[PDB]
Design a protein around this ligand. Sequence first.
Ligand SMILES: Nc1ccn([C@@H]2O[C@H](COP(=O)(O)OP(=O)(O)OP(=O)(O)O)C[C@H]2O)c(=O)n1
Ligand SMILES: [Ca+2]
Ligand SMILES: [Ca+2]
Length: 1203
Amino acid sequence: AEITASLVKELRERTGAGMMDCKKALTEANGDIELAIENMRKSGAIKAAKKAGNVAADGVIKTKIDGNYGIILEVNCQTDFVAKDAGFQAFADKVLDAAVAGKITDVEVLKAQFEEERVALVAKIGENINIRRVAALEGDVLGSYQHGARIGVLVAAKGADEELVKHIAMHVAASKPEFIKPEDVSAEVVEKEYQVQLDIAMQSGKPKEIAEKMVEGRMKKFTGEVSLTGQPFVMEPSKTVGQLLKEHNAEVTGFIRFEVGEGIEKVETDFAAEVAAMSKQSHMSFERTKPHVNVGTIGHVDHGKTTLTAAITTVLAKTYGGNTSHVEYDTPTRHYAHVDCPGHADYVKNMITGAAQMDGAILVVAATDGPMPQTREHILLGRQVGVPYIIVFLNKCDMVDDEELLELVEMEVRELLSQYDFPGDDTPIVRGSALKALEGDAEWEAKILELAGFLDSYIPEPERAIDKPFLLPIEDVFSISGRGTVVTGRVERGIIKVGEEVEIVGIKETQKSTCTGVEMFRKLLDEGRAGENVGVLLRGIKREEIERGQVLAKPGTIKPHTKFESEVYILSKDEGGRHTPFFKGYRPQFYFRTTDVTGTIELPEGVEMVMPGDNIKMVVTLIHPIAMDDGLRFAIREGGRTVGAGVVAKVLSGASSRNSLSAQLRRAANTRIEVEGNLALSIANDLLLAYGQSPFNSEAECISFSPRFDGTPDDFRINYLKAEIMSKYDDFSLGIDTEAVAWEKFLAAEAECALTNARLYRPDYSEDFNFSLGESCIHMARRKIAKLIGDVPSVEGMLRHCRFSGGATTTNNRSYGHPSFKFALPQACTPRALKYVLALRASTHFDIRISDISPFNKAVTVPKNSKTDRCIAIEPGWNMFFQLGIGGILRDRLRCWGIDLNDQTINQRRAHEGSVTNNLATVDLSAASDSISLALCELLLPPGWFEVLMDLRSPKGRLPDGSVVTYEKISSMGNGYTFELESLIFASLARSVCEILDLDSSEVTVYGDDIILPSCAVPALREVFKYVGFTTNTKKTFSEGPFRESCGKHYYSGVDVTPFYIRHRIVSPADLILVLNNLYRWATIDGVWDPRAHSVYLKYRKLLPKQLQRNTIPDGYGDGALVGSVLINPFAKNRGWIRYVPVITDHTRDRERAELGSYLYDLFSRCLSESNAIDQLICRSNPTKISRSTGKFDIQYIACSSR
RNA sequence: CAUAAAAU
RNA sequence: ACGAUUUUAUGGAC
Ligand SMILES: Nc1ccn([C@@H]2O[C@H](COP(=O)(O)OP(=O)(O)OP(=O)(O)O)C[C@H]2O)c(=O)n1
Ligand SMILES: [Ca+2]
Ligand SMILES: [Ca+2]
């Protein structure tokens, strides 16, 4: 010991002060009881001093009302945990209560008649605790609501009633409006937004009245949203609060809403680092099958959770061997991942959302203090989250000069533990010190070792996947001639051997069968194991009696349930979730392992609203059964949107849309808009007329107009529109116009490849004295290409990227374009290509069949613009299959040149920069794909690659004409690699031009033939291009002026001037809706209409069937409806707190899929997979369904919000 | 993959 | 015998 005093517990269990704070204030007073107590009071206020320097951004909010008087209180603290401690609840309650009767408003008066008690609590708790906001509200009627303790509101209303103010109070907590009426916004607070935003618009060049009217309309909006009155009432968001009030003759005097920790920043905490940051101040000085164990750390803010995780790491490092914001450390027998548990709600969330489960927590309390009041709430988290085991690490034991005092702390924590049903008497407890360990000290250092032993020994080894009874979630079901039914999926756990019997359980009543076999794409297997994608064959059972969503499992091991309790997390707006709350009868979709299943739910007694961001317990009952046991995770969905996650906590027992309205909309959709003449053109001219631009004289001018690259952006925007809008219209009369044009072009490109083939094959001119830019780039480009690409396409590469994913082949028309028919019907293949097919055949037990072995592809024609079609090439199926292989590998490799072919936004953005800086140019070639000659390829690519490219192309072509060509080009568009190969050729030449001019290669960026490189380089690029056979398109390439375009976006001095195109004669209501939408999107800023165009929009709107004028959807939901405000829409049905609106879709008949083919396709894909917040990982890929498109239209109801 | 919208 | 690539919204995600 050290003390002339031993029993400090009496001092403690009447103060709540730390053990040492106790024995030190006792030692220094000869050891007098009532005396020491007082001595501590004094020293108290001074300890709360370092508290101030602790950001207390948590806490609670309280509200009390007495007939007419109501007050709302906000008192802060540092954690979730103390926020729900009884102690802290009492203080805040008292301050609340003793602030109602004594109607206080001056915070400071309140913050002062309590200050002596404040320090009292702080001292005990050891956390900063400051009272904060306080306000009062009086009204002829007022009511309150609070949302747990995170948000409280006061609502005051005249001429209102009781239920009515509950509801408004709930709404205020949901939509947090700043003002009570749109007219309350400081007639100046806004005037700023209007002087500032009138320029935003006037600087686009929009003529005053236009920018003015837009900013006016824009602000009318800006105001109504942030004001109670013009906010869609959350309990029925079709009518607003203003309108809601007025139907109750009611008015709202005013409202208060406080939210815990509003406008307190709260510097973020990165745990993983914070720890590694201490493992530095001291670290300076097959057996890969070890089980993964997840541990959490949890305790008082400054008791040492972090410094301990350091010690755990340095020491385990020194001694033994050696998804974010965690740490991992290694034990000779196990592997650990370790999270901190800094808050109760944050943890509960992560444990729901599977983003941090726990095999055991380690509870860290400092022995100098002993357990704190809120330690109880730490342990309570453990119990509520179901942590299986809790180990205790007593910390800072050196600063305790009396062993018997350690015995005291130790026994307090054993009681709290047992108070919450944990094994108190048997729980490992370690008297140690984090500090001494990290600063080296075998003594205290061996205690960390002792704790880690307690991890290896006390936390039981978690059951390995393969050791659990077999379960495979069923993704699809195939009837296969002369084999029977096979299901596919990834086996979730265990092992299934052929022979063994299986139960199939889920949607319908359970069934039994026996495993006839198990197969993957490559081989047949004896057994399927955990984590393997397989097909499983079943005896007897017919295909029509198995559904996706059911499971396959060892009998009696899993059961079908409909009712159950769960813990769930509703995602925030900010996380792509819902943006509005739900209530009693929420009715979403519950996605289990592989399928949605609808279900109702009942909230827990006392909660009536749920908002994005909430944790919540709810009782879900499903419309039909699903195989579950507690532990099972599921997602919450609204029309394929994920808005929640949950886990089944305990299985229980337990067990809208319109007709005519639907029918009316369909009738209308199937109608035909009728007009005199060319409706597209009428719209276009009316549009030009509203913008003070001259109309189109004739069909012939529509396609022969050129914009002026100058003028203000606004004046250029409609002008360019004018030149683009009708430019691809396929229904013009006047024109000896054909596709004769396309084939002439097709013949011209071949003739150029002919020339360049002759040319380029001739490396020695006459006498080696004369040097050329073109020659030099080919030499430079080549060298670069080889370092990027290798001598040869790898087997790994090809095995990862070869696939069918298609449309039409030389054997299958578009009807049979789906990959599954490629595996079903035999595909053609080229003489040189035959080896590749043979190799596929020797790699699998399934039949791989060649239809006919020929050198030909089919040259055909597809629409392009009003002036010409464009010829493409339908390849032999097996050729395509491998072409996609090298296509896929070049895609991977091009990433090192900072070129990313799965993303055209990097080209769009550099197009934009270019229109501002003029330092980047956008360049276009003409028949780009058709101009890559054989010769150019053989000089640029490694021989190995070239041979592989030459095996894989179609060497010959067959025109619709009936004639043939022997291709002078390497390949055309339609071929599986053409596009990546252009990219490579174009990039390598441009990059070579950069080196030669002393510019960064990395400034080069390419997407097919949209090319962007520094402007200075264009003249030389033009020269190289001429040399190697390309013709650059002067009209589409810009290395100066204010205009740039790349990948479909067009810019003029930074402003977007991307046009829209009317491609077809408009006949159905859907066609009209397409055009009006494209016009919406072109002429709208943030939903607000440029007025010039709005007049045209309204005019042609009238052409639609009456009902389709009102059927509106938000932007970003397609074109089966007019884009506009969906809250206004009369056809929207709000069913179960999810809003559903009708949209026109293409009507389709069902069609027979190919069973083997689809099954092959399925397995082939799973193979592909195997060789190449974050809770998306609860969904899959979908069963193949073929369908024919009739030309009628159908109406379909879809979920939508406003995102 | 693809009906659909932009697009190379 | 309308294609190869990207992409986003809807549906093969009942
Ligand atoms: N079925 C198709 C059609 C086009 N493309 C790709 O588009 C690229 C270039 O074509 P565009 O840039 O759109 O224009 P071009 O047809 O080459 O000619 P122009 O600019 O004169 O219209 C190359 C080609 O691989 C393709 O891969 N497959
Ligand atoms: Ca081009
Ligand atoms: Ca282009």
